[PDB]
Amino acid sequence: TEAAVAGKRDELRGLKENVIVGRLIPAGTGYAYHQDRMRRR
Amino acid sequence: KPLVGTGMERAVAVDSGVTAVAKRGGVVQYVDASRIVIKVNEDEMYPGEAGIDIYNLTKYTRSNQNTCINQMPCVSLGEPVERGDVLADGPSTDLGELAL
Amino acid sequence: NQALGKKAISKMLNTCYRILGLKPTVIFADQIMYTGFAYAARSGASVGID
Amino acid sequence: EIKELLKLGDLPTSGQIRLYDGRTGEQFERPVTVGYMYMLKLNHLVDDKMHARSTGSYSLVTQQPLGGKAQFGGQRFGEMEVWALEAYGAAYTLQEMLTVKSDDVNGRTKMYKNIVDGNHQMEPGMPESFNVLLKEIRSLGINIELED
Amino acid sequence: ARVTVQDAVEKIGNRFDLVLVAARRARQMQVGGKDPLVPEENDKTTVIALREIEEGLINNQILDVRERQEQQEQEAAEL
Amino acid sequence: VYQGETTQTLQDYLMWQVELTPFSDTDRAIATSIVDAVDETGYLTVPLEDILESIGDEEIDIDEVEAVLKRIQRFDPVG
Amino acid sequence: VDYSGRSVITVGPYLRLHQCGLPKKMALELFKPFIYGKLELRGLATTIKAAKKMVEREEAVVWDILDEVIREHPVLLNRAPTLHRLGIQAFEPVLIEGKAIQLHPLVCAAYNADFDGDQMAVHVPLTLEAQLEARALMMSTNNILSPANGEPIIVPSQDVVLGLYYMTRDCVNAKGEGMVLTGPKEAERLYRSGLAS
Amino acid sequence: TANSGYLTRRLVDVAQDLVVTEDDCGTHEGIMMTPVIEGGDVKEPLRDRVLGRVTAEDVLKPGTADILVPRNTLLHEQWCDLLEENSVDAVKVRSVVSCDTDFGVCAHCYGRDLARGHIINKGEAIGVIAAQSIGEPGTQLTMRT
Amino acid sequence: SVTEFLKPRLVDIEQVSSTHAKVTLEPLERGFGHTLGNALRRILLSSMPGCAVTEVEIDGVLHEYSTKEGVQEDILEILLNLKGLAVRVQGKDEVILTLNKSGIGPVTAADITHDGDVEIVKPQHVICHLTDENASISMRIKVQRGRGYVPASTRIPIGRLLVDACYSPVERIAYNVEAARVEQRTDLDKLVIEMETNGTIDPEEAIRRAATILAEQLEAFVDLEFDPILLRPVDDLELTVRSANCLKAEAIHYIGDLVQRTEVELLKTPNLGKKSLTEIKDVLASRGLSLGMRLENWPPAS
Amino acid sequence: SVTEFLKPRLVDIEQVSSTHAKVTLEPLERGFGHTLGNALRRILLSSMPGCAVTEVEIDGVLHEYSTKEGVQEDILEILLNLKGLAVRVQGKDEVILTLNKSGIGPVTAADITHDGDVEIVKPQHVICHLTDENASISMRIKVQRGRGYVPASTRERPIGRLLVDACYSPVERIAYNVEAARVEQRTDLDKLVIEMETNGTIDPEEAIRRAATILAEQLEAFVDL
Numbered sequence A: 001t002e003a004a005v006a007g008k009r010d011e012l013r014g015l016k017e018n019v020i021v022g023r024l025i026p027a028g029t030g031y032a033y034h035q036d037r038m039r040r041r
Numbered sequence B: 001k002p003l004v005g006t007g008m009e010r011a012v013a014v015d016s017g018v019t020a021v022a023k024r025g026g027v028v029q030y031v032d033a034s035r036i037v038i039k040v041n042e043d044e045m046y047p048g049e050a051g052i053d054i055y056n057l058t059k060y061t062r063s064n065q066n067t068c069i070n071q072m073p074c075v076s077l078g079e080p081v082e083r084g085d086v087l088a089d090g091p092s093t094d095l096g097e098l099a100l
Numbered sequence C: 001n002q003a004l005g006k007k008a009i010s011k012m013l014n015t016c017y018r019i020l021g022l023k024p025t026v027i028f029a030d031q032i033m034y035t036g037f038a039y040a041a042r043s044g045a046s047v048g049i050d
Numbered sequence D: 001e002i003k004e005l006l007k008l009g010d011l012p013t014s015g016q017i018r019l020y021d022g023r024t025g026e027q028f029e030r031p032v033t034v035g036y037m038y039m040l041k042l043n044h045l046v047d048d049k050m051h052a053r054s055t056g057s058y059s060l061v062t063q064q065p066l067g068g069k070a071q072f073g074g075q076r077f078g079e080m081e082v083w084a085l086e087a088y089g090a091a092y093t094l095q096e097m098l099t100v101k102s103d104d105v106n107g108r109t110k111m112y113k114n115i116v117d118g119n120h121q122m123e124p125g126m127p128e129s130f131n132v133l134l135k136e137i138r139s140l141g142i143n144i145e146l147e148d
Numbered sequence E: 001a002r003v004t005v006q007d008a009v010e011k012i013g014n015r016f017d018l019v020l021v022a023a024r025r026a027r028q029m030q031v032g033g034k035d036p037l038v039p040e041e042n043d044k045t046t047v048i049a050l051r052e053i054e055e056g057l058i059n060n061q062i063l064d065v066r067e068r069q070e071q072q073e074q075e076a077a078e079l
Numbered sequence F: 001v002y003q004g005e006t007t008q009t010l011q012d013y014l015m016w017q018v019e020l021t022p023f024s025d026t027d028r029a030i031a032t033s034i035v036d037a038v039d040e041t042g043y044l045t046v047p048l049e050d051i052l053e054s055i056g057d058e059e060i061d062i063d064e065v066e067a068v069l070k071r072i073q074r075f076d077p078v079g
Numbered sequence G: 001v002d003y004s005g006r007s008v009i010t011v012g013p014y015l016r017l018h019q020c021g022l023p024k025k026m027a028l029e030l031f032k033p034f035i036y037g038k039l040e041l042r043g044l045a046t047t048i049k050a051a052k053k054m055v056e057r058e059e060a061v062v063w064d065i066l067d068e069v070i071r072e073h074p075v076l077l078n079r080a081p082t083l084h085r086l087g088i089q090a091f092e093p094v095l096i097e098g099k100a101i102q103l104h105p106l107v108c109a110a111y112n113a114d115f116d117g118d119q120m121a122v123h124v125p126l127t128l129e130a131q132l133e134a135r136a137l138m139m140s141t142n143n144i145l146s147p148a149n150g151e152p153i154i155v156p157s158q159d160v161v162l163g164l165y166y167m168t169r170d171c172v173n174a175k176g177e178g179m180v181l182t183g184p185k186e187a188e189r190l191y192r193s194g195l196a197s
Numbered sequence H: 001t002a003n004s005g006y007l008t009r010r011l012v013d014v015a016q017d018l019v020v021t022e023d024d025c026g027t028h029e030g031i032m033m034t035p036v037i038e039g040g041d042v043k044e045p046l047r048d049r050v051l052g053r054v055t056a057e058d059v060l061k062p063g064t065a066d067i068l069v070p071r072n073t074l075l076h077e078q079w080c081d082l083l084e085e086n087s088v089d090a091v092k093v094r095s096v097v098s099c100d101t102d103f104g105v106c107a108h109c110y111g112r113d114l115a116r117g118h119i120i121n122k123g124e125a126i127g128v129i130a131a132q133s134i135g136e137p138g139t140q141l142t143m144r145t
Numbered sequence I: 001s002v003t004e005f006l007k008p009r010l011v012d013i014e015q016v017s018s019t020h021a022k023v024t025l026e027p028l029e030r031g032f033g034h035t036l037g038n039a040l041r042r043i044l045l046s047s048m049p050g051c052a053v054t055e056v057e058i059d060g061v062l063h064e065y066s067t068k069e070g071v072q073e074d075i076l077e078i079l080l081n082l083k084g085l086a087v088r089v090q091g092k093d094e095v096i097l098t099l100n101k102s103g104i105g106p107v108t109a110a111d112i113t114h115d116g117d118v119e120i121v122k123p124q125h126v127i128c129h130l131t132d133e134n135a136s137i138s139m140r141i142k143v144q145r146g147r148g149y150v151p152a153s154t155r156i157p158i159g160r161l162l163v164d165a166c167y168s169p170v171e172r173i174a175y176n177v178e179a180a181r182v183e184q185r186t187d188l189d190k191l192v193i194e195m196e197t198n199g200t201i202d203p204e205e206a207i208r209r210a211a212t213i214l215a216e217q218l219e220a221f222v223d224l225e226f227d228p229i230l231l232r233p234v235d236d237l238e239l240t241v242r243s244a245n246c247l248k249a250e251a252i253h254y255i256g257d258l259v260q261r262t263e264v265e266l267l268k269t270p271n272l273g274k275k276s277l278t279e280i281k282d283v284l285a286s287r288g289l290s291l292g293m294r295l296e297n298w299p300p301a302s
Numbered sequence J: 001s002v003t004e005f006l007k008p009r010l011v012d013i014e015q016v017s018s019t020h021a022k023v024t025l026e027p028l029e030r031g032f033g034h035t036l037g038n039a040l041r042r043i044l045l046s047s048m049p050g051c052a053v054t055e056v057e058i059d060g061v062l063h064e065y066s067t068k069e070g071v072q073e074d075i076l077e078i079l080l081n082l083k084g085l086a087v088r089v090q091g092k093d094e095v096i097l098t099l100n101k102s103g104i105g106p107v108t109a110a111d112i113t114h115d116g117d118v119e120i121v122k123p124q125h126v127i128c129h130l131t132d133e134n135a136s137i138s139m140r141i142k143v144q145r146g147r148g149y150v151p152a153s154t155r156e157r158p159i160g161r162l163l164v165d166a167c168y169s170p171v172e173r174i175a176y177n178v179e180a181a182r183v184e185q186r187t188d189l190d191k192l193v194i195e196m197e198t199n200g201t202i203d204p205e206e207a208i209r210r211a212a213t214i215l216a217e218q219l220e221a222f223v224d225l
């Protein structure tokens, strides 16, 4: 309810968010992948 | 049988309904792997009655836990029995004693 | 050169890891387990009422 | 009384005898307590415990493997296992658990074909339960969407 | 065979980077037409890649140089 | 709650066998068209000309469709 | 998840620290697509249904195929509850007979497991990255220190401690006392001959 | 068991997103480490509180103005032995609390891996490790008074 | 049969050194690994003929606990050094050797007086050391022949020092039993024997001698591929004349060779178009075969 | 000399009973008594051949989880009793025995129809009991030769043929002792006494000779090497 009223936006920067959408977590061996995503984004 | 017990095996075996217990005294007229016929004594019979007790044993039936329920005779032909004696052993019972 | 309890064996493993490294330590641990099992079997240690 | 009964049967009073090793014939160095115990077999049989699965049937809604040996189901990889994989840093193992061994329908069939061809690579994709969650949130009158 | 990866870790400096380099080399040896730089002894491509890294024959810079050289040769010989 | 269980039909089994067969992209599209037009008793419900029309590519002749159909007819069950 | 199983754990005292004992009935199911690929690769099966029927019949050659495909391929063993990251570890399988999983004794402390009814689950990594992560991060030989405090986690216990304590003790008047030996090998030769205590 | 599980779930949720994302933040803040003494017994010596950490300032000898341990030094066993040789009772070290790194911490404000003998690497989920290290021994504590 | 037992078929030998060896035997029947290993270990330790130093006499030493002047090592150190001396004797069952040395340096086995029958395995075996120049060492060494290990404590004039006798050439032997299987049977033994001798004989000869002794002890009771379609010739396919000519020009003679060829390669084959490729795919599909098949090591030397 | 060993040989055999015997080996060198004793004990316990009941067929029964009228035992108990039948076969590796019995009384091993090449060593072995005068039992029993223990699960069959797990080993237990012997004027020679308890279907001397032959054939691999 708070997010819908505020119209919030989620950037998917943590471990749990990337687990929810089935991506590589930004830790361990998935850290370089997110670094490259930041570089190309 | 446990071979080291406490003396409560007979009470558990008999108070449970797994065994066949003589309702009246008499002589084993017929014995078989699936039925027992006892010839009741003349002093325990009712008037105008053929005095015999027929016990049909439970043979290889399924329990609630998908295990086996099976009764085996523990008496021989012609031997005397009295009221309350064990005629057949149920599962986990050895001569009227609990045997787990 | 002493009677090796739990603490002495752990100390031996820690010394091996600190001085030598990882592979000698895992080989040492496996050999320790084998020897301990073998000689515990050979001892015949039992428990009785006496 | 136990020692008296042992003496009646011509047995050592201490209750311990000398044993020999069946593989070498050598006597054990100390006397061993040998006797008789009453053992029970409990209704926990490994026959009912062993269960394995490669693939099988899935749910209609979540498209995830079912549960239970009778249904030939899979093992649940819960939150604590996810935490354990996150503490190791095993990101590819975790992503493989979350999509290809699970409700990601197209990657499921791509991975099997790749494995049969000798190519151990995956194309992860998007889980189906996230789409179900999006639809269920939209059914409440809330506009939730992916962008870019 | 392999029981430990400590030597390869010290060669690369990171476990997280070692996994990526070894996966790249193993995929080159598995799906590509590459041949191992060490004598394969009833080993799988992952263990072969780890043994190649352990001897200093494989790292990120070497892989990048090899890829650039192969691409240049392909583009030169295409005509 | 109730969700149900997925069931494998004849077409699902045939497509599973198609995915694990070395077809080309054109052959795989033809196989998808052929498996689509298979009824519950296992018979082809449309002529091969309809399949060729449904492919939508004009450089394919009936011989390729015939070869792919012959390959599919040897799947499990045979016939 | 797919490619997962579970069963009761027993003890394997012969195993090495990086090895586990996996039933071959479980491994036949868990590694089925790998077996299909290996059967098709060497001409034993020309189609996928032929390989499927060969595996269903459990022919004598599919066991050689399985022993070929499980050679260097880690599996993840996990016991619930997973209180820390040491509740999941990677091992190399050894195909065994029976239905129980054999576990190395020295890793029982990390799992907090004992052999009186505990069950364990096994998962199969599929891709090259997952296999290399299992080998390089989650392997038991990599996990010998506790991440919480830095203490070792491969502490010997019970029978090993009892045996090592018993062998390294001295008695005042024992057989063979007071003799001078050239080295440890002569000591073992005397012990096995029954000439020294 | 249920209370321990709930506690560790909350601890994981609060700190799941904390990762080592840098190598040094250049901060000079720190915490002063002294031996843990309660009443008449020393509960914890100084060595176990500064082992595997990074000094936030130069360590001076107690009797002189001579620099004993320089800045940005990972206190391994040898440094701790040197500190105990000269009777040092308080060392200013770097902690994750006083870290200037935005969205994560650096490898110097954290210190040693405690599973490997070296300094922590970039990309390590230290929050999950911390939550699991705190919550795992919760079944060795007590619930009833 | 009922009297037929398994016999070893994979005998492996690993020569760690000239005196250290590791033997592996498999497969064995269940439980025979322990039987054979224990019997061989007992025979190699307890009953094994050999020659060893029995007793010594030093001219300047009359008591076991004495201090020799000019020699760095103690008396029991010299006894330990003599206990490790390996000697081969061919003449008789008892020999006497004399060692005399003077000067400064390591007194070794090369200083023992030479004899035709007596042979020293290691001439460089160190006996002792002489520190000062004006000191000489003279000793008389008795060597005998026997079996196994005989401690000096079990043998309890003047100046005669007893030495524990190690006649057996075996210095160490250990065995281990692992699991092994034939294709059908899975509970079989695999026996590994690691053994080191003292240099007099090879480890293999020691094992053979032990086995021969054990066997002679029993003399009074012992009574006397690819799927077949892949191997078929390409002529089995009812191909057209042009397609068959192209295939023979491409040196394709077997079905495996054809099914290993992709469509892209066959498209670029000279004199081969699309109709012939489609016909080949049709005739292969009639037998449940395709063109994108991979084989590991196709040509089976046939 | 010292490279020459004294060879043992069988000295005395004492038949304490029909299933219990003592065998004496003499002379032995020092240490060879235990070496021979343990090997012989292991081989005798593990690798001896014998005959066992493998299949049964009773006229009226279809499976072992049933009963028969006039018989006080279940089919499972009868099969367990047959599992302990000791039979010595002297001409073949497989034989079929026939049992027919009627009337009230114990059906024992002496009721099996006599065969020329088959011997029953314990005729008093009770198989079952008939508790009715108009009750009869007829059965066919297959006996095969082998060694070891073969469960029936590991090893088309018509309905009514019952399988029995086969324990082919005739040896019940083995014990051995090493004592001091008086041979010539030597006091360092041993004597090995072996106590064998069996089921009565194997001779002690031939069992010892079979064990020795197996040991020698296993040692022939190390002899050449």
Ligand SMILES: [Mg+2]
Binding pocket: G113, G114, G115, G116, G117, G118
């Ligand atoms: Mg438990």
Ligand SMILES: [Zn+2]
Binding pocket: H024, H025, H026, H027, H098, H099, H100, H101, H105, H106, H108, H109
């Ligand atoms: Zn910082």
